[PDB]
Amino acid sequence: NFRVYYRDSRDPVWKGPAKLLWKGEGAVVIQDNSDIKVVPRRKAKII
Amino acid sequence: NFRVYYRDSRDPVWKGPAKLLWKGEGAVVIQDNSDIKVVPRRKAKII
Amino acid sequence: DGIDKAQEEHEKYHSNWRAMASDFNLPPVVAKEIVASCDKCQLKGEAMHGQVDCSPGIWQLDCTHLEGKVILVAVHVASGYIEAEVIPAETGQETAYFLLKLAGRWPVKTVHTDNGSNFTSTTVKAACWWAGIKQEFGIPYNPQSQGVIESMNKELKKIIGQVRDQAEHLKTAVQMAVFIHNFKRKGGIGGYSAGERIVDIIATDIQTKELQKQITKIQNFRVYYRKGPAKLLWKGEGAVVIQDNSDIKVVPRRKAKII
Amino acid sequence: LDGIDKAQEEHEKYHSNWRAMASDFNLPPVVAKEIVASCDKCQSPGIWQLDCTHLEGKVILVAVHVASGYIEAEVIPAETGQETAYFLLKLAGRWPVKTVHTDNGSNFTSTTVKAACWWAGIKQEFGVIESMNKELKKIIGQVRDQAEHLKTAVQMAVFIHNFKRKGGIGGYSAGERIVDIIATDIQTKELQKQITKIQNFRVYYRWKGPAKLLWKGEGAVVIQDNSDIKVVPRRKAKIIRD
Amino acid sequence: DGIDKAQEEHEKYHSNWRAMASDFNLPPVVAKEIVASCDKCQLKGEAMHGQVDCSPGIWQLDCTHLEGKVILVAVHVASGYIEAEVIPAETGQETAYFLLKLAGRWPVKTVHTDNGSNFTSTTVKAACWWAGIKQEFGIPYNPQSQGVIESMNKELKKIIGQVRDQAEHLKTAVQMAVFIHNFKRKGGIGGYSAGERIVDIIATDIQTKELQKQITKIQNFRVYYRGPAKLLWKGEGAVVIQDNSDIKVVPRRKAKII
Amino acid sequence: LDGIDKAQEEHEKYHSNWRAMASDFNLPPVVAKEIVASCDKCQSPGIWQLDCTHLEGKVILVAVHVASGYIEAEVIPAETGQETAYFLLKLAGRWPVKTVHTDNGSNFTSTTVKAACWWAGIKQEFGVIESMNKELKKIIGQVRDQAEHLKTAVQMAVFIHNFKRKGGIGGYSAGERIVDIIATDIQTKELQKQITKIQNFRVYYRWKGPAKLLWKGEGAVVIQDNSDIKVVPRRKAKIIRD
Amino acid sequence: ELQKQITKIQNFRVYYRDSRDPVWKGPAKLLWKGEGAVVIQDNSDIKVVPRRKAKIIRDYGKQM
Amino acid sequence: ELQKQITKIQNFRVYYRDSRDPVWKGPAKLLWKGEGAVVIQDNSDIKVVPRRKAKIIRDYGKQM
DNA sequence: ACTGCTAGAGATTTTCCCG
DNA sequence: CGGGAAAATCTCTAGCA
DNA sequence: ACTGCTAGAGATTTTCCCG
DNA sequence: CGGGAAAATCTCTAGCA
Ligand SMILES: C[C@@H]1CCO[C@H]2Cn3cc(C(=O)NCc4ccc(F)cc4F)c(=O)c(O)c3C(=O)N12
Ligand SMILES: C[C@@H]1CCO[C@H]2Cn3cc(C(=O)NCc4ccc(F)cc4F)c(=O)c(O)c3C(=O)N12
Ligand SMILES: [Mg+2]
Ligand SMILES: [Mg+2]
Ligand SMILES: [Mg+2]
Ligand SMILES: [Mg+2]
Ligand SMILES: [Zn+2]
Ligand SMILES: [Zn+2]
């Protein structure tokens, strides 16, 4: 798996860790506490 | 001489024309309506 | 050895891998391994920019607000051709009407808009459904997904300031600005104005579609590479393009037999 | 090059237009255009017609592109000069309108519409209109039950007519026809621009006096001299401004 | 011929030179000349970024606001070393006190701040005057002039978020953040932390000044190139000559020393 | 390289420290350091002392850098643990404090100051101090006329003392001395870090058993082998991790 | 038959981009248009570009 | 006399920039420090940098 | 499972027109 | 084959709620 | 007469350690 | 002389009121 730390929207503080459900070009679909979110890769770090 | 069209500060609409008293690196000192102003070259066009 | 001391140092100070390595003589790999285990140290994301869709059928819509008046704008991403209009109240009905006017004049196959309330209104959903348009929504509070249209807003607004003194109504000035942008500003990929560019884009789409249809109808070849009967698409100049299991692959003439 | 004599032969035997010769014979468009122009014997897209059709006491201003039947209809609250001027402004902005044909109504002659045409660079003037309008009315009646207003039904009918009604030589809807026509107009305009910018140059070959210059390529130059088209190497050709 | 038509087109549509030239077959020079004559068509300035001063003795000051509390911050431009402190009220007296504390601990020669009210307060002016500091102000509403300190206002703030759960008060968190930034984050030009970098900058300044003074005291040569000028350095066939506040690099040819 | 035997002879005759040998003999610092360490016969900057001086019924916490006389003084309202802890935190943040000397006051022993020292990584332990403090008091008395309050006078006195009172071997004010001392400490720390990084390597020269590798250059490698410092070409030396 | 159709399909300019490069590249000559992938030749480099990253035009300014 | 002092003054690293380039360049060896102009040598390139655009250090990670 | 971009301003480099 | 000046290309930035 | 910058995240390229 | 993997460098972006 992967660990993804993200900033969702207009929310300066970062969140995570979350599971990486899907990775694309320019955006990534993650699962934070069973909540599926979509975040641009400018607002995510994957480890 | 030169013609300088500038945006002064937090003022989206541009002004000018004004005379060019002095030109530097990154900022220019102009004379608009006999008022001497300093404007970053990012906020000025010289012709 | 120094791993435990550096771990305590980080737990207290949240040092970057560089400081940990230079202080406790750690290897950079271990320093970054430690720094990557601190949830409070993941305060930055990948430095890059995505790429919005540029298909011929993609249109990007957005509301802008000028002089206390709502201007609904749509842009053809592939060409930069814009259609804008002043609407009194930013509501679902007016947005659906504008979108339906747009669809009936140009071949709109998809609308990529922000998550505004009006663009999400069920009336707009029904209007898209009837006209066979596919709605797309950017990430919430991610204006970059709509960059093109957003850019146009500024551009559009700029032009208005130039011509707002030649008209009394704002709708008039908006139409003047749209006209100037579409048929009096030249640049872009083809040195065209936006209207000419969209005309060229759409005409080229139709032409290429029909040519490809005719060639496929007349031309048919089965190709073996290295292993099945792939469908030929292009051949010559040392390379051959073959479709096999929804895979467009280019292989040299060698190890590529046609029958 | 080398197909100019074939171009002349085919043109004389068949009297074809420059487009066809250039496409078939691979000639540059400019040389084909000057060939077709030479033949004295062998010797419109941006015009729309407006009409206000009344339904349910509501004015529907319909503009028809004669060359393709492309329809653009808008419900206007009242037959005032302001609304017609705004409609014309929208039309000119969205499409390259050069001339408009009207019925010389009270509103169509208003000073407001006059100024709108003047600024937008359109000139006013006073068999397809009737057929297209009747088709639009039929479609409106067909799809009037799916809309709770009249402007919505008008837009639905316009969409159906422009993009779902396929007809003509190639079974192409109105949208395809209009986009093709405007593309052809653009090609013509670019050709004319190149001709205008090149006609001011003179060429000395072999030295032989000035001759009309048609095309400059990579190693050859095609010129016109006394109705005779000649391809000359660049080395023995000198280009002069005046 | 087409110039009049192009002028009448631009007076209404404000077309760019490209469209004018393409439509009316104008030369690009003439199209740009026409477009440059329209005052309403000058809506963009030259795309570039200046360069802030990075002298050793320059400090950039700015107020940031965190959790409703004013944090006054100063940064050593040449090294990124930062001092910070929570002040109860964004007033002139507290800013002057902060600046006087800073001056007495580090060799501050000039301060470059925004045009905030507190930084313009006459108390701060007097404090700068007494401590022999030179006050510099960026162009109004041009935060890029302070791009260094502003940057720290982010970086410092970021650190404050990591260590705000280790302190009850915001002043303690601010001081912890300053400490971490100065002596626990490494990078920059020299791979140093900010504190090490400032120490190196100041020590190098003093050392270079003293060595140069001694060399000038002992070494002295008069040069003629191509009048009697001073010599500063010679090597690898090149010579550095000082003449009327002009530093020039000239080869040995047309360069003689007496 | 080169002047290594000369370095040994000079060290034996004069017992100089590695800094002087390396600077004079152009040697890398590491080899000079290993040379000086070899001689048994030939065999502090980040320690401050705090004292609370009471003037006009107001506490002034003065921290003195013993190695240079650098003074950092702050007026504090009350002799509480919180104020001293905050002062120590500011001092540690601004300067590299490793050990603090205190008079074992009640405030200095408070759990708050204990935690502040623990977090900032400082160690507490309980002739220059008195002279420095009395000099500060003299300057405060001198400049009090120019200050509206006492904190302003304290800061003016600190500035005058640190950057306007020039004295010592080289006539350097306290600021110059402290920057020099901290720079020297940084140089020492870098040398020690490099030594630790390199000490874990073995070298086989000419084959001869493992030897202590000291410096690696462009084409020469300086190693230690049984109190013997030898420069070997890069080839004849094989380096290993052990 | 196929000759002229191929010749005039390969006359369409194509502008493309890659996943990280944000600048549209020069007019690669078109070679084939697919549903979502277009095959092009940018100076004898035969590449496959996703349709969403491709602008296919018939540059009339160049064509004339 | 002058030899060792010159060597020491030339042992200092300098980082500089030009009027348009926004990124600091490599550590050019110092050659001379003036009031407002510092003369440096970046790989045998003798240049004059304004003092405000110059960071002069004595990098110890490299000195050691 | 989605995605920054557009147009203008100087700077710099080709490149056609003159030898 | 060598230059000159204009043309073409490149780099960079404001602003879009 | 003054002036965007800093630190981190992936990519990409050297370059020292193994043959 | 040729590679491998880590180190050094490079490019790019958020955000600072
Ligand atoms: C309530 C709707 C739905 C939810 O989102 C909000 C907020 N929003 C914000 C911007 C905005 O921030 N534009 C500036 C900008 C900044 C960066 C960039 F790359 C591009 C840019 F345009 C808009 O333009 C915009 O239309 C909206 C909007 O409509 N909404
Ligand atoms: C009332 C004082 C005096 C007059 O000016 C205002 C407004 N201002 C604005 C910003 C600001 O816009 N920061 C964001 C930002 C944007 C761009 C960039 F390059 C750097 C940046 F920091 C400040 O930070 C700031 O301190 C002030 C301020 O203090 N004042
Ligand atoms: Mg929006
Ligand atoms: Mg928007
Ligand atoms: Mg401020
Ligand atoms: Mg600020
Ligand atoms: Zn951490
Ligand atoms: Zn204009």
Tab-separated table of C-alpha atoms and ligand atoms in Angstrom, chain C residues 10 14 38 41, ligand 7:
chain	number	residue	atom	x	y	z
C	10	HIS	CA	13.445	14.606	15.828
C	14	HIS	CA	11.105	17.782	13.942
C	38	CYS	CA	6.494	11.823	11.507
C	41	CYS	CA	6.432	16.582	9.066
M	7	ZN	ZN	8.894	15.301	12.672
